[PDB]
Write an enzyme that holds these catalytic residues in place. Structure first.
Site, mmCIF file in Angstrom:
data_model
loop_
_atom_site.group_PDB
_atom_site.id
_atom_site.type_symbol
_atom_site.label_atom_id
_atom_site.label_comp_id
_atom_site.label_asym_id
_atom_site.label_seq_id
_atom_site.Cartn_x
_atom_site.Cartn_y
_atom_site.Cartn_z
ATOM 1 N N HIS A 91 0.857 -1.184 0.000
ATOM 2 C CA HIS A 91 0.000 0.000 0.000
ATOM 3 C C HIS A 91 0.887 1.225 0.000
ATOM 4 O O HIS A 91 2.101 1.107 0.159
ATOM 5 C CB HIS A 91 -0.940 -0.003 1.203
ATOM 6 C CG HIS A 91 -0.218 0.039 2.498
ATOM 7 N ND1 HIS A 91 0.174 -1.086 3.167
ATOM 8 C CD2 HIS A 91 0.265 1.061 3.230
ATOM 9 C CE1 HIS A 91 0.842 -0.735 4.263
ATOM 10 N NE2 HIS A 91 0.904 0.567 4.324
ATOM 11 N N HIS A 93 1.047 5.529 1.420
ATOM 12 C CA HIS A 93 0.557 6.689 2.157
ATOM 13 C C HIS A 93 0.944 7.896 1.361
ATOM 14 O O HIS A 93 2.060 7.960 0.811
ATOM 15 C CB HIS A 93 1.206 6.759 3.537
ATOM 16 C CG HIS A 93 1.021 5.527 4.380
ATOM 17 N ND1 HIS A 93 0.087 5.417 5.368
ATOM 18 C CD2 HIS A 93 1.644 4.296 4.337
ATOM 19 C CE1 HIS A 93 0.162 4.194 5.895
ATOM 20 N NE2 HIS A 93 1.101 3.504 5.290
ATOM 21 N N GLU A 103 5.306 8.939 5.730
ATOM 22 C CA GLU A 103 5.184 8.684 7.209
ATOM 23 C C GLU A 103 6.541 8.855 7.850
ATOM 24 O O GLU A 103 6.697 9.707 8.724
ATOM 25 C CB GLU A 103 4.599 7.288 7.424
ATOM 26 C CG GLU A 103 3.094 7.296 7.208
ATOM 27 C CD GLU A 103 2.396 6.145 7.790
ATOM 28 O OE1 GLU A 103 2.974 5.015 7.665
ATOM 29 O OE2 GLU A 103 1.276 6.265 8.305
ATOM 30 N N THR A 195 0.991 1.682 11.627
ATOM 31 C CA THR A 195 0.770 3.093 11.752
ATOM 32 C C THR A 195 -0.686 3.488 11.623
ATOM 33 O O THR A 195 -0.999 4.688 11.605
ATOM 34 C CB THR A 195 1.581 3.941 10.750
ATOM 35 O OG1 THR A 195 0.987 3.695 9.461
ATOM 36 C CG2 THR A 195 3.051 3.609 10.796
ATOM 37 N N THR A 196 -1.576 2.521 11.688
ATOM 38 C CA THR A 196 -2.984 2.734 11.862
ATOM 39 C C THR A 196 -3.424 1.892 13.026
ATOM 40 O O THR A 196 -2.793 0.874 13.313
ATOM 41 C CB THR A 196 -3.888 2.318 10.637
ATOM 42 O OG1 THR A 196 -3.841 0.938 10.398
ATOM 43 C CG2 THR A 196 -3.449 3.070 9.422
HETATM 44 O O1 LIG Z 1 0.829 0.339 9.059
HETATM 45 C C1 LIG Z 1 -0.012 0.679 8.142
HETATM 46 O O2 LIG Z 1 0.094 1.194 7.000
HETATM 47 C C2 LIG Z 1 -1.371 0.341 8.605
HETATM 48 C C3 LIG Z 1 -1.734 -1.110 8.433
HETATM 49 C C4 LIG Z 1 -2.950 -1.549 8.868
HETATM 50 C C5 LIG Z 1 -3.397 -2.835 8.760
HETATM 51 C C6 LIG Z 1 -2.592 -3.737 8.166
HETATM 52 C C7 LIG Z 1 -1.445 -3.260 7.658
HETATM 53 N N1 LIG Z 1 -0.679 -4.169 7.191
HETATM 54 O O3 LIG Z 1 0.484 -3.806 7.502
HETATM 55 O O4 LIG Z 1 -1.336 -5.333 6.618
HETATM 56 C C8 LIG Z 1 -0.931 -2.028 7.801
HETATM 57 NI NI NI Z 2 1.783 1.628 5.891
#
Ligand SMILES: O=C(O)Cc1cccc([N+](=O)[O-])c1
Ligand code: NI
Ligand code: NI
Length: 257
Positions: A91, A93, A103, A195-196
């Site tokens: 993913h 940010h 971040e 971080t969430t």
């Molecule tokens: O840290 C994050 O970007 C949030 C986050 C939240 C939930 C799962 C995640 N993951 O690492 O599969 C990451």
């Molecule tokens: Ni992340």
């Protein structure tokens, strides 16, 4: 019912998740002058040849590109890690403006975005169990700066109109995450957290020193996504970064001089 706003953003999360004020929270500022070169660091092995992407999902806070993690097909090893870590998803940010979005920061510098490739430690059997352990996850973090286009990102950018709103998914097969990596695998590492919410302290962070370049047009497309579900008022998915947290009793190690 958490998010990134004034009323439900980072500064509120501690009320539901007291671990927000813990001893190993992420992200952090990386003070390049104080990070110490560690000669014990084993070299980083990224083995993505067999990766199997499956799907892209707007989860309401970001989008995730998900992989088949039922076998050792895309794995991270070496570096600071003991054992084998399997890729589950990546993913990003990002910001509302090019001047913020990452971040981690580097000597207080904010990048336009940050890519997180999330891996779990195979000794724990699955992701769910791994997040309950202090060494359960390894996240490879890559900064994005705005400049030239990243060709290997365009396939991701172009599908984003199909997952505009929370809860939408689309098939996303045959994506090669190698096309998102910079030339060098020099890195900083430290122990931290998700971080969430739920902010679990389960992550070995590996942050690459060399950013990738993406175009303005590419990042713009990220900013067209929505936090909301379809049929709800539009709220652009921007500024989905947690700010830097106190380093406390941690040392950041560098793999390079
Ligand atoms: O840290 C994050 O970007 C949030 C986050 C939240 C939930 C799962 C995640 N993951 O690492 O599969 C990451
Ligand atoms: Ni992340
Ligand atoms: Ni909630």
């Amino acid at each position: 019912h958490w998010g990134y706003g004034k009323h439900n953003g980072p500064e509120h999360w501690h009320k539901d998740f007291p671990i927000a004020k813990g001893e190993r929270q992420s992200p952090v500022d990386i003070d390049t002058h104080t990070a110490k070169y560690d000669p014990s660091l084993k070299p980083l092995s990224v083995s993505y040849d067999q990766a199997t992407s499956l799907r892209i999902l707007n989860n309401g806070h970001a989008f995730n590109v998900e992989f088949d993690d039922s076998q050792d097909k895309a794995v991270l090893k070496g570096g600071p890690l003991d054992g084998t870590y399997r890729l589950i998803q990546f993913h990003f940010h990002w910001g509302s403006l090019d001047g913020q979005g990452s971040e981690h920061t580097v000597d207080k510098k904010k990048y336009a975005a940050e890519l997180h490739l999330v891996h779990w430690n195979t000794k724990y059997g699955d992701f769910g169990k791994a997040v309950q352990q202090p060494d359960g996850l390894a996240v490879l973090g890559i900064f994005l700066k705005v400049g030239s286009a990243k060709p290997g990102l365009q396939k991701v950018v172009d599908v984003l109109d199909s997952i505009k709103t929370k809860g939408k998914s689309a098939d996303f097969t045959n994506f090669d995450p190698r096309g998102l990596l910079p030339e060098s695998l020099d890195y900083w590492t430290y122990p931290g957290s998700l971080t969430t919410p739920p902010l679990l302290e389960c992550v070995t962070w590996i942050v690459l020193k060399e950013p990738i370049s993406v175009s303005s047009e590419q990042v713009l497309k990220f900013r067209k996504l929505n936090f909301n579900g379809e049929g709800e008022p539009e709220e652009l998915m921007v500024d989905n970064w947690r700010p830097a947290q106190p380093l406390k009793n941690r040392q950041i190690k560098a793999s390079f001089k």
